[PDB]
């Protein structure tokens, strides 16, 4: 945590008040009643958005019974509530886009139905999240509103529906728009301003607590609601400034190198929602209050490009999946806003030759924003080019590649990272995008979290220990040599009796060389070294391992003092078997030798 | 008439001294008292449990804004009402089921229904919402009015609250909390704070209607207050307000007890007056009761006296000739006013069925039906009544003989509720079967209300059992009326002067129409003095079935195994006019066609008289 306070430095309340754009004149989308301009913006999305609306002409708005909320308390079941909720939210979002697309009034009755139904609900908070209310119960209490991820999203959608359709709604019956205004005030505007204690707001934040994606996510949703629904200038400025203060807490908490330590799947709702907030704030101040030119924000964006190896494979340290991806439309808009050419071409590359279409789902802002960027992204040329080395020195992540298709990811860190795995000093090797030395990733400390099942030694036969203090020391990257080095000794407990253990990775054009150099206090038990892999693993001769997997072939050359064995790991958990298939392997390297000082060299290269 | 029977029985001060607090008046066992529920339920137990089980996966139905908008767009009520009623019926059935079983199996669904009901902006029907300030068919979250629907919804919610508060609060006390709020917002407060709801009749003046809405809504509100309002000062004020409101209704109906609309509203008119009086009595420990008032007994006995048999009811005015009733209701009302006739009639109306709990959506009638089943089951079926019933102010006369003839006749005036131009008419039934009929109610058209009402054949005296005097029919209007109407009960003679129901053009001084029923025959007479003989009189009779003319002056009618001869003056030429029935509301009663017998003559004179005789033959 560092006090940058970038937003507060861009303005105080008074300054902000002077640049706030009133009466919703900041809105970038045309008027509902502009068949011509919507037609231009939409292009080929039009027919498709109309077709999606047509499928909802007879959609029955789903009631959420009290028992669905009670179920959270009874059994911890969340989906019984969330499925109908999210179905309603998506229906309302789609209908919005379809009516913007068609403009013939045909989807207005269903929009009005969804909006009216939504006001009758006692709350838009998820059943899993409602226990943060005073009562601590999972059922809505009409006496209190809080804000959560869901309720903020629902609020912003409702605000956008109000914004586009109030005029035709009012013609049918003005009480609908009236009650939407009350609902948004009671469930978003007022709680936001009157309750300092919501955990994601990060006011009263002490060391040891979390600030995560909830902060920029909920603040971006609150901000839209104010910008759309609050027409008093003093009230507006106070809320917007409040949001600036709250987001500063997140910006202060995340490391400047810009790595997202939760991975490429958290990216879209962490960095991605910081971006959204900042786009929203810029738009709302006529671009006068903008952090989109800040280099930390570009680095936070580019993590998504750097961390994406290819064909759906991504770097997956911690409790994260080796298969991931991202929203190419979001990535384009984020890249274009921070002037990352790399991000823009990377978005066109992820399209994998498909035409970009409107984002659906239930996030009104991204849906609407997707409409703006479409023609542009369709014009963008696809490439995934990036430097040979990326070095995140505070997060201690290092990516190194060569022109022959090897990509290595390595890390230092500490055994209390977000969604920790005990993995200080580990690496992952990809060849032509395919994992060859892998990181197992996330189940549904289980074994996937143990250093025993990462690409690491068991020093004196002992694994890494969990804990803040169990950490890398002296992590370095030589960007030009493609050398990563760290001392992992302090990640192990006392009984490991190790003074120093340097693990280093050197990638040249032909090979990856892995070294271990150690000094022990006492040689108690033989070291063991493990590697994780998959596919077709053979042992053609002593000191040699061959790995054949999705068209790739390498050899791992290892010291002849070790005995190599392949351990089969059946994957019954589907969240793992959906990535890797039915089984993966741990190669164990074991020995009878025990010395106080020594070293190992391992060499991985492709072969014919 | 300013009877003010309830205000005479107590004022607010008396009331306050006799109200029973803490719902100690409730006549049902505690939910936890399983032995007492089992004894009360009898064979209803397993029936109600099975009905409950059918609803364990019931999905509570949302009502979309467009369903309410549709009333305005097209007049469609059912789009809104069908899911609404389904919800209410499910909630009512689940209450009964859970009372029957007592194991907590239906609690979750009761909770769900209750919570869903709180989230609705309003419980008012779409057709009724346009009485709000905005005059729209969509709820307005800022404002509540009460209607037929919302009152019943409110009462049902109050009963759910009363029975299941404890197991609800075990789950999550916020549900009961929101229920109390909802009932307060939607029933208690509007009832107290708004003096201008049309059905309360606090602003009533001559010309305006008081109808069934009054006792029906008052009785629902009264329940809510007795269940939910624990401040005795607020309770007394509410109850006394309901007494003043319901007095408007009692003042308005005729003391002779005839429901002039006819039997089809009896269940929700006199029957809801009964419900209101029972609730009031229960809530005051019996201290404020009009259940002993002879007028209330006559109101309830009207349902007996007007029910001929086999689904056939007396149907003057715009009313179906087919009707019926809820035997359980009829029994309870009968018992309460000490009417053996009504209690035996209820048994008769069961048609040999065992009495089971009332289902539907009326929580009070469902619960009350549990209390009465065992005794109604024991009651002997009979439909006994005096040979003559004479309603002297409404001017309805029913006369019967031991050989199966039932004659209904009326005086009155051509501005009665749901009026037909029918002063002086009669209807004859033979072993319950209509033989000289009164066509009754058709499907509403634009012409049904307004001028042109009397261009609809069913409304005209031309198509009732009456003369066309100098070829002229009766005219609509308050002063088009009977005079010198008498009934000799001993001799079974009804007589009336119908001259003044006819316009000037009919140029008639007097026309006495009289009905004499003996042990075998009905004699109909006309005796007339015209001002001038313009045109020949015509006399009409309405009938159905198989109509034949074996000789001059004779007609035979055979219908549904009954057979009669009609003897008419040979001066008349008799023709049979076929009336093919396009309208299902008619054809569902009468079949494909009915007939008008026309009796016509070239005679024309200032005075004369006609005799007709109807007797059973073959
Ligand atoms: C119970 C509780 O309070 N747990 C907190 C924990 O909060 C949890 O954080 C999760 C997170 O990963 O951020 C939440 O997961 C996300 O919830 C969303 C709301 O239902 C859902 O929308 C996410 O998925 C995306 O939504 C998009 C849309 O808005 O259109 C889609 O288009 C998108 O592609 C879709 O995937 C969902 N993420 C998932 C499933 O990975 C969860 O609601 C929440 O409970 C806190 O982070 C931690 C912090 O220490 O404390 C716990 O106690
Ligand atoms: C639309 C409107 O306001 N109409 C007013 C009349 O009220 C109607 O009276 C009917 C009646 O009591 O027969 C009502 O019918 C009943 O409705 C309840 C609730 O849905 C239901 O339980 C019954 O089965 C049903 N009975 C029927 C159909 O016979 C109807 O809801 C109601 O709209 C009012 O009588 C007249 C009086 O002047 O005014 C109209 O404006
Ligand atoms: Zn891992
Ligand atoms: Zn009639």
Automatic annotation (TrEMBL), chain A:
It comes from the Bacteria. One of its GO terms (cellular component) is cell envelope. Keywords: Metal-binding, Signal, Zinc. Its main location: other. It comes from Bacteroides thetaiotaomicron (strain ATCC 29148 / DSM 2079 / JCM 5827 / CCUG 10774 / NCTC 10582 / VPI-5482 / E50). Pfam families: Hepar_II_III_C (PF07940). This is Heparinase II/III-like C-terminal domain-containing protein. InterPro entries: Chondroitin_lyas (IPR008929), Hepar_II_III_C (IPR012480). Zn(2+) binds at residues 421, 439, 454. GO terms for molecular function: lyase activity; metal ion binding. The keyword Metal-binding applies. It is found in: Cell envelope. Residues 388-522 form the Heparinase II/III-like C-terminal domain. Gene3D superfamilies: 2.70.98.70, Chondroitin AC/alginate lyase.
